[PDB]
Design a protein around this motif. Structure first.
Motif, short mmCIF file in Angstrom:
data_model
loop_
_atom_site.label_atom_id
_atom_site.label_comp_id
_atom_site.label_asym_id
_atom_site.label_seq_id
_atom_site.Cartn_x
_atom_site.Cartn_y
_atom_site.Cartn_z
N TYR A 147 -17.68 -38.32 129.04
CA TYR A 147 -17.69 -37.13 128.67
C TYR A 147 -16.58 -36.79 127.50
N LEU A 148 -15.42 -37.05 127.78
CA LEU A 148 -14.32 -37.00 126.86
C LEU A 148 -14.45 -37.97 125.83
N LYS A 149 -14.99 -39.10 125.71
CA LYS A 149 -15.23 -39.86 124.48
C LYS A 149 -16.37 -39.31 123.77
N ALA A 150 -17.43 -38.83 124.47
CA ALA A 150 -18.52 -37.96 123.85
C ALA A 150 -18.02 -36.98 122.86
N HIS A 151 -17.10 -36.15 123.36
CA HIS A 151 -16.35 -35.21 122.58
C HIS A 151 -14.96 -35.31 121.84
N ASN A 152 -14.73 -36.56 121.69
CA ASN A 152 -13.62 -37.00 120.82
C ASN A 152 -12.04 -36.33 121.42
N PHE A 153 -12.16 -36.28 122.82
CA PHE A 153 -11.06 -36.03 123.38
C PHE A 153 -10.45 -37.22 124.40
N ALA A 154 -10.96 -38.43 124.35
CA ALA A 154 -10.34 -39.44 125.16
C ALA A 154 -9.03 -40.13 124.49
N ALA A 155 -9.09 -40.16 122.96
CA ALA A 155 -7.84 -40.93 122.48
C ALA A 155 -6.66 -39.95 122.75
N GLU A 156 -6.66 -38.64 122.81
CA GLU A 156 -5.34 -37.88 122.97
C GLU A 156 -4.99 -38.22 124.41
N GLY A 157 -5.39 -38.79 125.32
CA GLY A 157 -4.99 -38.87 126.56
C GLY A 157 -4.93 -37.91 127.75
N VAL A 158 -4.93 -38.18 128.85
CA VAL A 158 -5.12 -37.47 130.02
C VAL A 158 -3.70 -37.00 130.61
N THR A 159 -3.33 -35.78 130.76
CA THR A 159 -1.95 -35.75 131.24
C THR A 159 -2.16 -35.09 132.65
N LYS A 160 -3.36 -35.01 133.44
CA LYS A 160 -3.36 -34.55 134.78
C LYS A 160 -5.08 -34.89 135.09
N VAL A 161 -5.17 -35.37 136.38
CA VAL A 161 -6.39 -35.18 136.97
C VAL A 161 -6.41 -34.86 138.25
N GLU A 162 -7.15 -34.19 138.88
CA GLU A 162 -7.23 -33.46 140.13
C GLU A 162 -8.66 -33.71 140.79
N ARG A 163 -8.73 -34.10 142.09
CA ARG A 163 -10.02 -34.16 142.69
C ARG A 163 -9.79 -33.40 143.97
N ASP A 164 -11.17 -33.14 144.64
CA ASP A 164 -11.01 -32.44 145.85
C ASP A 164 -12.82 -32.59 146.29
N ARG A 165 -13.30 -31.90 147.18
CA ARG A 165 -14.50 -31.70 147.63
C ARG A 165 -15.24 -31.00 146.82
N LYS A 166 -14.92 -29.80 146.03
CA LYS A 166 -15.60 -29.29 144.91
C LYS A 166 -15.65 -29.97 143.80
N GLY A 167 -14.90 -31.07 143.49
CA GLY A 167 -15.08 -31.59 142.25
C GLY A 167 -13.86 -32.27 141.48
N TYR A 168 -13.86 -32.23 140.25
CA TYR A 168 -12.93 -32.99 139.42
C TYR A 168 -12.37 -32.16 138.16
N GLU A 169 -11.13 -32.03 137.98
CA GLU A 169 -10.48 -31.27 136.89
C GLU A 169 -9.69 -32.51 136.12
N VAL A 170 -9.71 -32.55 134.53
CA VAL A 170 -9.04 -33.26 133.80
C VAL A 170 -8.21 -32.31 132.71
N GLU A 171 -7.07 -32.45 132.39
CA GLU A 171 -6.30 -31.98 131.51
C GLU A 171 -6.03 -32.89 130.39
N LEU A 172 -5.77 -32.49 129.32
CA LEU A 172 -5.54 -33.21 128.28
C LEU A 172 -4.28 -32.95 127.45
N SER A 173 -3.45 -33.73 126.76
CA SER A 173 -2.30 -33.51 126.01
C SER A 173 -2.34 -32.12 125.35
N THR A 174 -3.26 -31.97 124.72
CA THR A 174 -3.39 -30.67 123.82
C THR A 174 -3.40 -29.42 124.81
N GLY A 175 -3.77 -29.33 125.90
CA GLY A 175 -3.90 -28.23 126.92
C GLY A 175 -5.10 -27.87 127.27
N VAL A 176 -6.14 -28.50 126.65
CA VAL A 176 -7.66 -28.47 126.81
C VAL A 176 -7.82 -29.06 128.46
#
Length: 116
Positions: free
Chosen positions: A75-104
């Protein structure tokens, strides 16, 4: 002692990993949690079995690439958000959350589909 799977996770994904601190949170009728701070400033939360629940990089840094689940990489690559890197990832039973260097940040449900 940090559970095996958590030490394996740290040793698998991080370059020359060194532990700065470990905080063990024990609650009376709940499951033990572990918070680990590495010397490079990475913070990781693990459940009682040693499965990661959250990985966050120090400001200015990004986490290693092998951690974010494939569907989210795609998903990140398809939206040109992979290159800038991930600053945070979270998971739980409800799913996943990724945060990027820019705050997105993006949330995905248990099935790997975008959710609000």
């Amino acid at each position: 002692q940090l559970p095996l799977p958590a030490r394996n996770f740290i040793n698998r994904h991080f370059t020359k990993p060194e532990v700065s601190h470990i905080k063990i949170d024990k609650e009376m009728l709940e499951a033990t949690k572990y918070e680990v701070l590495l010397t490079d400033g990475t913070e990781i939360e693990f459940d009682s079995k040693g499965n990661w629940e959250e990985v966050s990089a120090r400001k200015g840094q990004v986490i290693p690439a092998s951690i974010v689940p494939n569907f989210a990489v795609d998903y990140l690559k398809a939206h040109n958000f992979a290159a800038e890197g991930v600053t945070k990832v979270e998971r739980d039973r409800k799913g996943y959350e990724v945060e990027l260097s820019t705050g997105v940040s993006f949330k995905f449900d248990k099935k790997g589909k975008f959710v609000k």
